[PDB]
Design a protein around this ligand. Sequence first.
Ligand SMILES: [Zn+2]
Length: 458
Amino acid sequence: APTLPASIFRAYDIRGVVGDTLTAETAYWIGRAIGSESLARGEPCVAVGRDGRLSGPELVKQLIQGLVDCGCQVSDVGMVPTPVLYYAANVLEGKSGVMLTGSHNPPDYNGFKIVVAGETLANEQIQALRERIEKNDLASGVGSVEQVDILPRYFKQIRDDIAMAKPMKVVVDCGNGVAGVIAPQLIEALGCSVIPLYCEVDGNFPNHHPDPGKPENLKDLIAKVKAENADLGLAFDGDGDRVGVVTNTGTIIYPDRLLMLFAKDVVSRNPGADIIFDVKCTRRLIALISGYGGRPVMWKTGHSLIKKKMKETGALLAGEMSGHVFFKERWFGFDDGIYSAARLLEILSQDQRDSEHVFSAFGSDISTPEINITVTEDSKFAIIEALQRDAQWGEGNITTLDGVRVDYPKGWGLVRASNTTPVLVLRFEADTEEELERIKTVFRNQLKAVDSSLPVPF
Ligand SMILES: [Zn+2]
């Protein structure tokens, strides 16, 4: 084996630019590393899927050949959403699965999301794959390939379990990503009228990029929902493990508010169930889960990390601010925007109120938008650490799982380091304006105690 760039081996995935940091050869040796790791955990059987990127149909050939050259039995599910690959890794013979995807990123990117013997890899497990390649610590064998058509089965699984009470009219925006293969069709079959936006699978991404996380990528959805007097809008990211939600009046429903509703529902049938959310999610969600008789568990951001935490705690539901929603009740416990969409429509169809009122009934607190402060790559983590070390927070309940979150009786604030950019990311909330200013002040003062030069835009 040759020398691969370490920079493509990231915290919860592998991601690079095709023809650049990610070549055909690279993808082969990754298959080889993944195949050897799966065999070491006693799993020869591996499912493989591709998203709808331009480099997909050719580049998976190297991944599959990598796996085959280990002795693995590969089940090739073709072009499918990311959660449909996770699904195959749950219902097929093997518990290993590789998804060739570049998520919500620009066309030239691709990469791998990896499940080995039930375990979604992260951090050190991913570095171990690179290390296997470098060390030439690789299995050798004459493997196997089998074509598997899994989408009709996934489709039937969801349709059979979802019970919609009334018809709804829904705008669906796939952003020309791979969710277009199943989302509009599934939602139609649930008993809805679907208004398709950008559901043709096109790896050029000729319209907006399939990233519901940037509000500008939601404009067309909002305009269409309003103009068609639709009951809801849904936006999927490129690979389908993420969903964005807008109401009949075009209100963006952030994932923590979405979680409030799902938690009410899941906990109602499951007294005492654990429910996971990340450090960026509103305090109201803590209260709400507890009030309904569930056990709230705050965890780290990162799909691989939430999914691990779910197995460790038995949690029936998890979600995070980026829009990954993980159902275990009635499901398999992986993040799936398409299944979450269905679960949302099921609940909404059972309410006589419009979606705007279902979500607004949870009420509000005084909230800031997410605040970004560009720092440097050199100082990024050291500022968080200086805070974790020296900052004075008074009587706050301090969480240092991921940056520094402080929960006070009447509100909270968070500051964390961006993992991919030289940026500090902050959020604040409180039940009054006067309290929000007090918490902002506490964070402003503690940052200025670190570096009196830091630009604090609040
Ligand atoms: Zn995604």
